[PDB]
Ligand binder design. Sequence first.
Ligand SMILES: CN1CCN(Cc2ccc(-c3c[nH]c4ccncc34)c(OCCc3ccc(-c4cccc5ccncc45)cc3)c2)CC1
Lengths: 143, 139, 143
Amino acid sequence: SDKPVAHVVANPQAEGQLQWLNRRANALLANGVELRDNQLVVPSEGLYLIYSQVLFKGQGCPSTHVLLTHTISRIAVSYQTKVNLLSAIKSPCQREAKPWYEPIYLGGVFQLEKGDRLSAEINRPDYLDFAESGQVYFGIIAL
Amino acid sequence: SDKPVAHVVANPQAEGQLQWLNLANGVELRDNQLVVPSEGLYLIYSQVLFKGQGCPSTHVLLTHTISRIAVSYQTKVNLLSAIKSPCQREAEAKPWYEPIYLGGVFQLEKGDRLSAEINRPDYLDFAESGQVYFGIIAL
Amino acid sequence: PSDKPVAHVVANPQAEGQLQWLNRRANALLANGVELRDNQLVVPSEGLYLIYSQVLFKGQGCPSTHVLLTHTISRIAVSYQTKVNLLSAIKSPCQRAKPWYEPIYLGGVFQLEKGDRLSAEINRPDYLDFAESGQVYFGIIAL
Ligand SMILES: CN1CCN(Cc2ccc(-c3c[nH]c4ccncc34)c(OCCc3ccc(-c4cccc5ccncc45)cc3)c2)CC1
């Protein structure tokens, strides 16, 4: 099978930032997919399933009202055109100490071109949970 | 060289409804259902997105189900199904977004019909927090 | 006629307070070498595998304080019998006797070895909802 695939996970050696890595235990890059400048690089044109899940965690609900965002964007090599493919906003606090857990999960099927770069970004890396092995991931599967 | 596939998307113009739009190698979209062209193993998958205005009650239930209509029985059997309670606790009411995913491998027969339905089409949304699709891929 | 190892297992609706996987039932299967032994899927050959699962949780009202629901897909190495997490997700169904429903869907691409055992586990089997078909399943597809 020649179809491009990748499943990348949060690098724990880089806490305070969401840095993706093809970690040895549960992550990989195959059939042309490269990981460059924290982005997944598409080797060929076609329909791809793009997916990601991030887990935020905080202890208590103080000061004001916290906004957690997760975003998947595409950069085409032509004109360096940047477009938002998937995005989601979540507010973990309804006034207030007890810890909260806010997962954000995104996915869809998209037409990608050769050289397309895909990034998966969060606004609050300080809330990212590095507790268990595979809760923070990003991937692409060519159909 | 090739295997039966379909990737159908929902119509944004079909207000308060889940209507699929077009798909290759004999996979046909007929009566808002995917038609299996030949016997074999198929990856069946779907995604729906729901959006509500706020949380006026916690009794709101969202469901999404993929069903098979067998040709030699004409019965509707559940292949994949999910239930979600989008609201916990009830101020200016803020919209919520909830995607539901389904997917599995099934042995299907020539002429089997597959439908992908939701209980709350009034909540169906086309924002970037998800996508609205249904598909089959022959393995 | 597909030669690739595949499997789609479903939960036993008769195994009270447990997550026990079954095949040969109505719309479940094991094909091209995939075996079900000790509640785990057994890999027949080295390669990349599409791994997916769904569990549904149901509770009547919100007791204790805040309950954490988790779903984890693990790789049990054939050599050292080491258990490693591949995919994992957490959910907080209670936000401080009325029923709530929480589905957890996991998916990804993984490199597996011949004889690898895959498990799909949950921390609260007492909240599992298998009342109807297609609610709780686990499966693999060789690429
Ligand atoms: C031999 N060929 C077979 C077909 N294959 C392409 C292909 C097509 C469809 C699916 C699929 C299954 N269930 C689905 C549910 C919804 N949408 C799509 C799917 C697929 O599954 C690979 C495993 C997988 C399953 C779910 C997800 C997932 C989908 C959507 C949001 C997410 C958010 C967070 N985490 C995970 C997400 C990610 C990977 C693979 C190419 C090779």
